[PDB]
């Protein structure tokens, strides 16, 4: 059907589409942020670890 309610139904489908795109983008960048925290914190901790091994 092509009523205004059907236009809203298709607009809700497109809202789900934009929600999919935006959620994918946000969680992708946020999970990459978590991995970057992991590796950068690991690199700083690795500097500290190398200091600790030199000392010990």
């Amino acid at each position: 059907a092509l009523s205004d309610a059907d236009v809203q139904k298709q607009i809700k489908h497109m809202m789900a589409f934009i929600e999919q795109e935006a959620n994918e983008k946000a969680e992708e960048i946020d999970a990459k942020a978590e991995e970057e925290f992991n590796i950068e914190k690991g690199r700083l901790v690795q500097t500290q670890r190398l200091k600790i091994m030199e000392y010990y």
């Binding site: 092509l2 236009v7 298709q10 489908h13 589409f17």
Partner: protein, 49 residues
């Protein structure tokens, strides 16, 4: 999977004129078009010409 949509709308632009011309009447339709195409749904002089 999710489909497309075709939408109607309230329109302010003027409709064009179309005639579903056929092989035999094309020349006459052109003859009457030579002096200005008829407005939307006014009587066509082509079938009488």
């Amino acid at each position: 999977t999710v489909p497309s949509i075709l939408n109607r709308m309230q329109t302010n632009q003027t409709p064009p004129t179309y005639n579903k011309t056929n092989k035999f009447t094309h020349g006459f339709q052109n003859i009457v078009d030579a002096y200005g195409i008829g407005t939307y749904r006014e009587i066509n002089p082509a079938p009488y010409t």
